Amino acid sequence: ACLSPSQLQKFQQDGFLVLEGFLSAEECVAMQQRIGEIVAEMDVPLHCRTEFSTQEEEQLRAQGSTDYFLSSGDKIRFFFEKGVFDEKGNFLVPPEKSINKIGHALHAHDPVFKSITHSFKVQTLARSLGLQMPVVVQSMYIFKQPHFGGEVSPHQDASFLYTEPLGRVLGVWIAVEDATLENGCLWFIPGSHTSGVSRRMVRAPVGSAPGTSFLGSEPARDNSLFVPTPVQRGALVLIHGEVVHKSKQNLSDRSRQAYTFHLMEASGTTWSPENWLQPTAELPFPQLYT
Ligand SMILES: O=C(O)CCC(=O)C(=O)O
Numbered sequence: 496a497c498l499s500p501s502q503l504q505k506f507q508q509d510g511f512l513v514l515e516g517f518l519s520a521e522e523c524v525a526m527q528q529r530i531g532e533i534v535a536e537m538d539v540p541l542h543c544r545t546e547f548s549t550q551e552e553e554q555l556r557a558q559g560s561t562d563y564f565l566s567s568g569d570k571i572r573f574f575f576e577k578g579v580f581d582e583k584g585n586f587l588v589p590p591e592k593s594i595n596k597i598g599h600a601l602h603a604h605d606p607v608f609k610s611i612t613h614s615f616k617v618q619t620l621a622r623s624l625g626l627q628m629p630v631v632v633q634s635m636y637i638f639k640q641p642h643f644g645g646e647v648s649p650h651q652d653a654s655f656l657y658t659e660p661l662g663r664v665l666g667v668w669i670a671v672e673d674a675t676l677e678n679g680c681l682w683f684i685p686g687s688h689t690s691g692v693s694r695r696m697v698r699a700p701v702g703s704a705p706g707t708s709f710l711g712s713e714p715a716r717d718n719s720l721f722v723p724t725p726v727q728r729g730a731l732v733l734i735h736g737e738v739v740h741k742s743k744q745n746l747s748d749r750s751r752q753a754y755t756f757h758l759m760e761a762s763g764t765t766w767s768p769e770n771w772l773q774p775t776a777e778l779p780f781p782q783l784y785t
């Protein structure tokens with residue numbers, strides 16, 4: 496729950512912190528079980544139903560997909576592995592075995608994830624971090640399917656969840672299953688969170704033309720600078736908004752399920768209107784503290 500002065504210091508130094516056994520095995524089973532039900536009732540998205548042949552379509556598919564993503568801030572939607580489709584856009588395996596991640600409002604529209612997000616343990620940790628008015632800006636469930644579970648390239652979360660000033664966005668990453676060097680565990684570059692961000696993702700403003708694009712670019716960095724952070728089920732990994740982290744493709748037989756959510760210190764902070772994710776009247780970023 497609450498961090499000791501020591502762990503608190505380590506976080507400031509590294510930009511991330513590993514807290515083994517944060518959650519119990521039963522809490523992990525609860526998430527695993529519920530996500531299983533959510534996948535079972537899933538409907539393949541409109542843009543993923545129709546296959547394509549010409550760009551006239553392949554393009555319209557990528558557009559519907561973009562719109563699907565852009566308006567998922569307050570929904571529970573499915574995003575699939577990019578390489579699980581043939582060339583005409585057909586699934587190579589069942590869609591329910593092709594899901595890369597689910598988001599982005601599990602924390603608000605699902606009782607199990609919501610309850611876990613606002614638990615006693617999470618609120619105290621947040622308090623021990625001195626968070627004033629923390630709100631939940633987004634949440635995701637990441638599968639890391641066996642054998643092709645997509646890699647997540649090097650990045651900083653503030654690149655997508657930009658604010659003013661920086662240092663106001665924090666990520667909570669929870670291992671539902673064991674994360675190892677074999678199944679796509681996280682890797683961090685310790686101390687890489689003190690020089691701001693090099694890139695930012697932005698969405699088209701008022702004026703239709705719905706879409707995303709980047710400003711700046713990820714500076715290639717020394718791969719040897721990454722340190723792996725394999726953890727056992729139930730571990731929580733705190734992720735500073737500017738720390739550089741990544742995860743390799745899952746080449747093992749087991750998946751590497753994880754539940755994540757990001758908090759923003761609303762106190763004296765301004766959420767960039769250019770972030771793809773904007774709060775809706777229905778779901779303005781909810782408070783963490785209960
Ligand atoms: O689970 C992963 O491999 C990446 C998740 C991540 O980058 C995040 O929650 O910030």
Ligand SMILES: [Fe+2]
Pocket residue numbers: 650651652740
């Ligand atoms: Fe991240």
